[PDB]
């Protein structure tokens, strides 16, 4: 990241290399600023979760949150977490980032029965009462809620132990992300507490249901289970935290042209933003799913590139140790805006600009060259399109020297004119030589 020569040396993994034109990776591009743009929505309302009667696991309560801004720092102070089991997320990841939906399923459940909700369990509680989805990033937490928060437990807290129907006694299991059917609920709500399999007939089909209660396993620090499932759908993000990220700036006009880390609508990445002229959507994608632009809140369209995007080639000769840069397929009037992304000496050359450096060729903008008319037959420093680089005759210890540009003349063979008559012309050798 000091020179283009040092970036050429760090790639290819050696110091003593031969002459040639090499493709060079970047080593001095770091994110400087930070940008954050997200929509503001009215706050999510979590009163039903913590300030009402605790739901029963047989008929648990589900609430789906959409187009609201939450605050996890307040929610975690009202509970004492005993154990959290997250699938493809973390609570630190739940405190950040935008979702399309936020589903919370909560019910009252004793803390001694964690094994009955673990994945792979074969008990009646998973089979007939609550089956977790496990197809979206979800985290199930076990918490104790104080009675001073507003939670309460009353009535009977029961769970279905068996629910089968029909003449073949087919078990009415619970699909993942589902609840017990209304037939099982109606059979349970008349079923005895002790756990006797009574028989009923709902809608012409025999049904049998048994239940058991756990209302005597609940105390004043009421044990509660909160299952939080999020969904990710880019271009449809609605639930984001009230807290804006701390470093970030909310104005992009002073960060244009520099590699910044952006958190625009729950997605994180690094890139360079530049204003460009070219709306059924906010983000703009290419054919290969790479965001190439976005529409801002004001009237402006910033097309975003990756942090490194300009192809850089280094022309180097092992004798005299000189080097030069080739910015491939890019105009010379655009390099001075993207400078911060190059090496330190190249950045120091483009800032405080001297236009002697930048020459525009048919293969891109070159640096460290001078225009010449001399042509060479051998081409060891080919730039393509019949251009060869003529290395200087001064070594690097005496100071940097410029390369020569434009070479590869035609052989121009000897011309014999046709008489176009009865006779013709022949080109015969007077002298000869032997070549091997």
């Amino acid at each position: 990241g000091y020179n283009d020569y040092t970036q050429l040396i760090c790639s290819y993994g050696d110091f003593n290399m031969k002459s040639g034109v090499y493709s060079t990776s970047y080593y001095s591009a770091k994110p400087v600023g930070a940008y954050y743009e997200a929509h503001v929505y009215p706050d999510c309302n979590f009163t039903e979760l913590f300030r009402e009667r605790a739901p029963t696991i047989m008929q648990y309560k589900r609430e789906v949150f959409t187009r609201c801004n939450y605050n996890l720092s307040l929610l975690l102070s009202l509970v004492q977490v005993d154990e959290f089991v997250c699938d493809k997320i973390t609570p630190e990841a739940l405190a950040t980032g935008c979702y399309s939906s936020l589903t919370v399923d909560w019910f009252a459940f004793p803390y001694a029965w964690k094994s009955y909700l673990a994945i792979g369990s074969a008990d009646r509680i998973v089979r007939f009462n609550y089956n977790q989805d496990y197809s979206n990033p979800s985290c199930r937490i076990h918490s104790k809620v104080n009675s001073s928060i507003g939670i309460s437990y009353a009535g009977a807290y029961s769970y279905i132990t068996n629910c089968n129907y029909g003449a073949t006694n087919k078990d009415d299991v619970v699909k993942p992300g589902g609840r017990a059917s209304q037939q099982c609920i109606t059979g349970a709500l008349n079923s005895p507490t002790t756990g006797q399999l009574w028989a009923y007939n709902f809608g012409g089909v025999p049904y049998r249901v048994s239940r058991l209660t756990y209302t005597d396993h609940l105390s004043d620090p009421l044990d509660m289970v909160y299952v939080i499932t999020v969904k990710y759908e880019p271009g449809a993000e609605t639930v984001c935290p009230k807290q804006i990220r701390p470093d970030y700036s909310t104005n992009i006009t002073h960060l244009l042209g520099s590699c910044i880390s952006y958190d625009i609508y729950g997605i994180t990445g690094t890139g360079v933003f530049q204003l460009c002229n070219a709306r059924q959507q906010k983000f703009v994608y290419d054919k290969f799913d790479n965001i190439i632009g976005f529409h801002s809140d004001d009237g402006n369209y910033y097309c975003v590139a990756p942090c490194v995007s300009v192809p850089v080639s280094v022309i180097y000769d092992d004798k005299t140790n000189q080097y030069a840069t080739l910015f491939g397929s890019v105009a010379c009037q655009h390099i001075s805006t993207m400078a911060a992304q190059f090496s330190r000496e190249t950045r120091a050359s483009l800032v405080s600009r001297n236009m002697q450096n930048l020459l525009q060729t048919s293969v891109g903008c070159v640096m460290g060259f001078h225009e010449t008319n001399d042509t060479v037959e051998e081409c060891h420093l080919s730039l393509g399109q019949s251009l060869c680089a003529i290395p200087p005759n001064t070594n690097l210890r005496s100071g940097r020297s410029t390369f020569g540009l434009g070479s590869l003349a035609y052989n121009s063979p000897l011309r014999v004119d046709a008489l176009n008559s009865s006779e013709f012309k022949v080109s015969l050798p007077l002298n000869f030589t032997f070549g091997v």
Binding site: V64, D133, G178, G203, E233, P234, A236, Q281, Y285, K287
Partner: protein
């Protein structure tokens, strides 16, 4: 009026990103090609069919082709349990919470409600043994909820959790509508985005229904053929989708 994949009939647009000029292979809820659906006709000469006796299975979801290939909107009743009414043996009773989609006014205002349907003990009402059927019968803003007025003469609607209203502008062209239930609730899809040919279903509402819907009935209507809408089921099918320049699905392949 069968499903045609080359016209992309009944395909649901993927939620979120707008795809453009690429082909996409998805396996998601889609109408099966060649399905004729079930034709429902509202008379206009009051005069109804027995559409309230069926209790068709909901399955994964349904899609509806409304109007041309008079444009009278459908009325729907979705629920979890289906059975007979008491003391008359007549089918059509929906137990527990029941989703109602009622096209009030002339099809310009919609009522969506999710609540119990308690029969009334009056003559020609359910539970009276004079029962035949329930139906919806068709300036200042009091008939904006007249479909609700017709449906509350037969049922009490006593404990109601969700209620919303939607404004749609009057038109006569083709239109689609779809209902899909997942773990986030009941998703209502429509093709009212009206961009270019359209005929693609986009999400526009979500009802917080967490009980599994197992049945749907078509509420009979009478205005005093003149009405034809076809209800096609949805299946978990592999499809191949073609997006055009504007970003709409033009071709489909049933795979």
């Amino acid at each position: 009026e069968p499903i045609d994949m080359n016209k992309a009939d009944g395909v649901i647009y993927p939620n979120g990103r707008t795809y453009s000029n690429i082909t996409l292979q998805t396996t998601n809820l889609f109408p099966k090609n060649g399905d004729l659906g079930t034709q429902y006709v509202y008379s206009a000469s009051a005069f109804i069919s027995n559409y309230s006796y069926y209790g068709n299975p909901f399955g994964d979801g349904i899609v509806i082709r409304i109007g041309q290939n008079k444009k009278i909107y459908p009325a729907l009743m979705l629920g979890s349990s289906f059975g007979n009414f008491s003391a008359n043996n007549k089918s059509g009773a929906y137990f527990n919470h029941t989703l109602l989609i009622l096209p009030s006014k002339c099809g310009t205002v919609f009522q969506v409600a999710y609540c119990l349907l308690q029969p009334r003990t009056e003559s020609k009402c359910p539970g009276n043994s004079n029962y035949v059927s329930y139906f919806l019968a068709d300036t200042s803003d009091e008939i904006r909820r007249n479909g609700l007025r017709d449906i509350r003469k037969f049922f009490n609607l006593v404990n109601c959790t969700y209620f919303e209203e939607f404004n749609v502008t009057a038109d006569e062209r083709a239109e689609w509508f779809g209902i899909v239930q997942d773990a986030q609730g009941v998703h209502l899809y429509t093709s009212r985005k009206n961009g270019f040919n359209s005929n693609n279903l986009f999400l526009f509402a979500t009802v917080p229904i967490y009980d599994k819907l197992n049945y749907y009935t078509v509420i009979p209507r009478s205005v005093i053929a003149w009405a034809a809408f076809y209800i096609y089921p949805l299946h978990q099918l592999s499809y191949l989708l073609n997006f055009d320049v504007n970003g709409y699905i033009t071709q489909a392949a049933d795979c």
